[PDB]
UniProtKB/Swiss-Prot annotation, chain A:
Alphabetical keyword list: Cytoplasm, mRNA processing, mRNA splicing, Nucleus, Phosphoprotein
List of residues that carry Phosphoserine: 236
Gene3D superfamilies in alphabetical order: 2.60.34.20, Aar2, C-terminal domain-like
Note: Present with 7330 molecules/cell in log phase SD medium.
Region: Leucine-zipper, residue numbers: 244-265
Subcellular localization, as worded in the UniProt entry: Cytoplasm; Nucleus
Family: Belongs to the AAR2 family.
Subunit structure: Heterodimer. Interacts with PRP8 (via RNase H homology domain and MPN domain), competing with BRR2 for the same binding site. Component of a U5 snRNP complex that contains at least the U5 snRNA, PRP8, SNU114, AAR2, SMB1, SMD1, SMD2, SMD3, SME1, SMX2 and SMX3, but is not a component of the U4/U6-U5 tri-snRNP complex.
GO cellular component, one term: U5 snRNP
PANTHER family cross-referenced by the UniProt entry: A1 CISTRON SPLICING FACTOR AAR2-RELATED (PTHR12689), PROTEIN AAR2 HOMOLOG (PTHR12689:SF4)
Entry function: Component of the U5 snRNP complex that is required for spliceosome assembly and for pre-mRNA splicing. Involved in splicing pre-mRNA of the A1 cistron and other genes that are important for cell growth.
InterPro entries assigned to the protein according to its UniProt record, in alphabetical order: AAR2, AAR2_C, AAR2_C_sf, Aar2_N, AAR2_N_sf
UniProt name for this protein: A1 cistron-splicing factor AAR2
From Swiss-Prot, chain B:
Domain writeup: The MPN (JAB/Mov34) domain has structural similarity with deubiquitinating enzymes, but lacks the residues that would bind the catalytic metal ion.
Impact reported for residue 105 to K: Severely impaired growth. Reduced growth at 30 degrees Celsius. Strongly reduced growth at 16 degrees Celsius
Organism of derivation: Saccharomyces cerevisiae (strain ATCC 204508 / S288c)
Self-association state and partner proteins as the record states: Component of the U4/U6-U5 tri-snRNP complex composed of the U4, U6 and U5 snRNAs and at least PRP3, PRP4, PRP6, PRP8, PRP18, PRP31, PRP38, SNU13, SNU23, SNU66, SNU114, SPP381, SMB1, SMD1, SMD2, SMD3, SMX2, SMX3, LSM2, LSM3, LSM4, LSM5, LSM6, LSM7, LSM8, BRR2 and DIB1.
Cellular localisation: Nucleus
Protein name: Pre-mRNA-splicing factor 8
Start and end residues of each stretch annotated as RNase H homology domain: 7-237
Length: 300, 237
């Protein structure tokens, strides 16, 4: 079990760690989060009490180093940093635990939610979507735009998701215009799975990361990417059986975990109604279809 | 964006554009089978591709053989239309290729877009106008060449005959759409007006009769009256 200490909490802020979140008052003595489960990625995120705009946060994996949070009064936000001095860092953490100034990552043992949301997400892949190669952790916020959004402005700050576009030469073989547009199997399996992502796990990893960014920061371009990657599978007639079963489980926990009050903007009516009811794979998302109807039948 | 009443004069500027109408690509008669079921038989069709500024018509004849052993024909017809339009563009020299293609039916946008991916600087546009180009097979010479075809064939016409020697494109297109609107609303009457006078003939290289300027005014008035009448009968006004 690992720890992310906080130097201090100088401004009132709601802090999240994965799907949990705590309200911290200005200069309340908060000094970090302990008992964070080893073995998965994690994300710590922030929304200031005064600017309910710009949710921002950091993706990290505690196996890749010792990380802490410190408020910067010039840039006006909680920054994640790495402590290279191993001794200096257990000293900080152990003193803060002794004084009991840390929240415990509050994982119920029956609960596989976070595992299920992050099953295919790997820190090394995140750091290629968010290129800042001098840090081991990755910053994301509400406003960052994707490489695809840009093409239609600052590239250092972009989300470099894989571009998917159903009306492109990449997606459409010359001579199979009608075939490939109506059945995206060649775009999914040859171009994307075999060609770019290499395997289904990396594909699912990007899909899950896009969802989480949409959920935790309301990043709209991530929401577009998550929907695009679902639609590409559901609009393919020929999908490996293991992918369809795993897709149903992935989407199930994503829909399960969404705040009920956010189904209006995070969920795209056309994509979901086509996936669940009109697509080749309409009958292959039994668990996802069942929870969508019982929770957001309006959308449908 | 979409073409409509507001940007209507853009049709007659010097940017090459083509209308494409697919209504007559897939044509069927519906009949009863010996067992009482219903079946369709296809007849020859055509794509109606028209330069509204010059009158040049690219009439691509769709022979019934293209449908043989195919499913979801009404869907296939849109992709065949888009295939053939894209082939036409590729066949034209660069300086004759259109800068825009306006499809008369919105269902053609995606198939044409996908077939034109090689021509990213050609804009594919819908239209809000209710254009009468489905009545093209009410023009006797066009109907005749479609029905007689025994194989795929491109036949070229000037849909304005020689009108442009005396009138502008704007007026020529207005004449054409009025004639086609009338043929569409009551073909029998419309055709009666055009031929009632045996002394006004259709040149061998023309589609419409050789009316003088004055006779065209009488004609256009007769066609307007025809259209208005049908409307009160349709709706009871």
């Amino acid at each position: 079990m690992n720890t992310v200490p906080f130097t201090s909490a100088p401004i009132e802020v709601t802090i999240g760690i994965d799907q949990y979140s705590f309200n911290v008052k200005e200069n309340q003595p908060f000094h970090g989060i302990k008992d964070i489960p080893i073995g998965h990625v994690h994300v710590i995120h922030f929304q200031h009490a005064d600017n309910s705009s710009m949710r921002y946060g950091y993706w990290f994996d505690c196996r890749m180093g010792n990380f802490y949070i410190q408020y910067d009064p010039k840039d006006g936000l909680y920054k994640m940093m790495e402590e290279r001095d191993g001794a200096k860092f257990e000293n900080i953490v152990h003193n803060f635990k002794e004084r009991q100034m840390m929240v415990s990552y509050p994982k119920i043992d029956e609960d596989d939610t976070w595992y299920n949301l992050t099953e295919f997400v790997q820190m090394d892949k995140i750091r290629k979507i968010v290129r800042k190669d001098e840090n081991q952790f990755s910053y994301v916020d509400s406003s960052m735009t994707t490489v695809q959004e840009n093409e239609l402005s600052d590239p250092a700050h972009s989300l470099n998701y894989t571009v998917i576009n159903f009306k492109s030469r990449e997606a459409i073989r010359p001579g199979h215009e009608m075939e490939d547009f109506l059945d995206k199997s060649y775009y999914l399996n040859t171009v994307m799975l075999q060609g770019i992502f290499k395997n289904s796990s990396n594909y699912f990893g990007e899909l899950q990361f896009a969802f989480l960014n949409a959920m935790f920061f309301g990043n709209y371009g991530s929401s577009l990417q998550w929907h695009a990657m679902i639609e590409l599978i559901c609009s393919s007639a020929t999908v490996p059986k293991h992918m369809l079963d795993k897709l149903d489980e992935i989407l199930y926990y994503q829909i399960k975990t969404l705040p009920e009050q956010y189904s209006d903007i995070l969920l795209n009516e056309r994509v979901w109604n086509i996936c669940l009811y009109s697509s080749f794979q309409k009958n292959s998302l039994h668990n996802t279809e069942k929870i969508m109807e019982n929770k957001y039948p309006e959308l449908l | 964006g979409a073409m409509n009443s507001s940007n209507y004069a853009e049709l007659f500027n010097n940017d090459i554009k083509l209308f494409v109408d697919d209504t007559n690509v897939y044509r069927v008669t519906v009949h009863k089978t010996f067992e009482g079921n219903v079946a369709t038989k296809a007849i020859n069709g055509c794509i109606f591709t028209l330069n509204p500024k010059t009158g040049h018509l690219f009439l691509k004849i769709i022979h019934t053989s293209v449908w043989a052993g195919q499913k979801r024909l009404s869907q296939l017809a849109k992709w065949k239309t888009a295939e053939e339009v894209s082939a036409l563009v590729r066949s034209l020299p660069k300086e004759e290729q259109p800068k825009q293609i306006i499809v008369t039916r919105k269902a053609m946008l995606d198939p044409l877009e996908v077939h034109m991916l090689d021509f990213p600087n050609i804009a594919i546009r819908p239209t809000e106008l209710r254009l009468p180009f489905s009545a093209a097979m009410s023009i006797d010479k066009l109907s005749d060449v479609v029905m007689k075809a025994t194989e795929p064939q491109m036949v070229l016409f000037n849909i304005y005959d020689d009108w442009l020697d005396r009138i502008s494109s704007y007026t020529a297109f207005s004449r054409l759409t009025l004639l086609l609107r009338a043929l569409k609303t009551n073909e029998e009457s419309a055709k009666m007006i055009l031929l009632s006078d045996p002394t006004i003939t259709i040149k061998s290289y023309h589609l419409w009769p050789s009316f003088t300027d004055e006779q065209w005014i009488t004609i256009e008035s007769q066609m307007r009256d025809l259209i208005l009448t049908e409307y009160g009968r349709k709706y009871n006004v």
